[PDB]
Design a binder for this molecule. Structure first.
Ligand SMILES: NC(=O)c1ccc[n+]([C@@H]2O[C@H](COP(=O)([O-])OP(=O)(O)OC[C@H]3O[C@@H](n4cnc5c(N)ncnc54)[C@H](OP(=O)(O)O)[C@@H]3O)[C@@H](O)[C@H]2O)c1
Ligand SMILES: Nc1nc(=O)c2nc(CNc3ccc(C(=O)N[C@@H](CCC(=O)O)C(=O)O)cc3)cnc2[nH]1
Ligand SMILES: [Mn+2]
Ligand SMILES: [Mn+2]
Ligand SMILES: [Mn+2]
Length: 159
């Protein structure tokens, strides 16, 4: 089973200038809990943005060019990326925009954080047909001293 996990600001913005400009520790904690002990697939630009391997996960990087770091696994196609995960219950696709586009048609689950923040970005999460997806979990949080915007965690399952 393939799942996508992402945090979306207003208008489905996910990044600007190869970065995420907000800081929401509660959402990074949610990301860690939902990805630990699972393989994670990311594109090369996201790998450069994170800047190190994510511990406790098998890190698989998509790139058309040879890998430059043997602490992670490098693959050259979507099918190779999936194969490199092995026989696991759930594969997590962690972006970015181009990678989410390719994996959305193959995904059964979306873990989305909706952040109440306006930022002028250059990368968007794919348009997803709402009728295809059922909301199975949602949890709203107001802003607090650690998290400067309100946010909503949602899990959607393909109908
Ligand atoms: N808010 C969030 O949840 C979130 C999550 C992840 C990322 N982001 C943000 O998203 C942005 C990066 O997204 P992006 O769309 O620019 O890049 P991306 O999807 O991370 O990476 C694209 C790169 O991945 C490789 N790639 C993708 N598909 C491939 C395929 N089928 N075969 C081979 N290689 C393939 C290519 O690398 P080569 O050029 O080497 O071939 C391509 O240039 C950053 O701003 C980041 O901060 C946000
Ligand atoms: N909901 C969500 N939030 C995100 O920030 C996010 N980020 C990415 C890609 N970028 C990043 C950037 C940093 C870290 C990171 O530092 N993670 C640590 C944090 C642990 C914690 O804060 O408790 C990790 O071990 O996962 C992960 C992904 C993909 N999907 C996401 N999905
Ligand atoms: Mn092929
Ligand atoms: Mn198999
Ligand atoms: Mn806000």
């Amino acid at each position: 089973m393939i799942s996508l996990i992402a945090a979306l600001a207003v208008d489905r913005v996910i990044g600007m200038e190869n970065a995420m400009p907000w800081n929401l520790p509660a959402d990074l904690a949610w990301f860690k809990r939902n990805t630990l002990n699972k393989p994670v697939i990311m594109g090369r630009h996201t790998w450069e943005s994170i800047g190190r391997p994510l511990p406790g996960r098998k890190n698989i990087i998509l790139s058309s060019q040879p890998g430059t770091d043997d602490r992670v696994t490098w693959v050259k196609s979507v099918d190779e990326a999936i194969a490199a995960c092995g026989d696991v219950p759930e594969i997590m696709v962690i972006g970015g925009g181009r990678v989410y586009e390719q994996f959305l048609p193959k995904a059964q689950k979306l873990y989305l954080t909706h952040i109440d923040a306006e930022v002028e970005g250059d990368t968007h999460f794919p348009d997803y047909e709402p009728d295809d997806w059922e909301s199975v979990f949602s949890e709203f949080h107001d802003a607090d001293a650690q998290n400067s915007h309100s946010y909503c965690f949602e899990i959607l399952e393909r109908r």
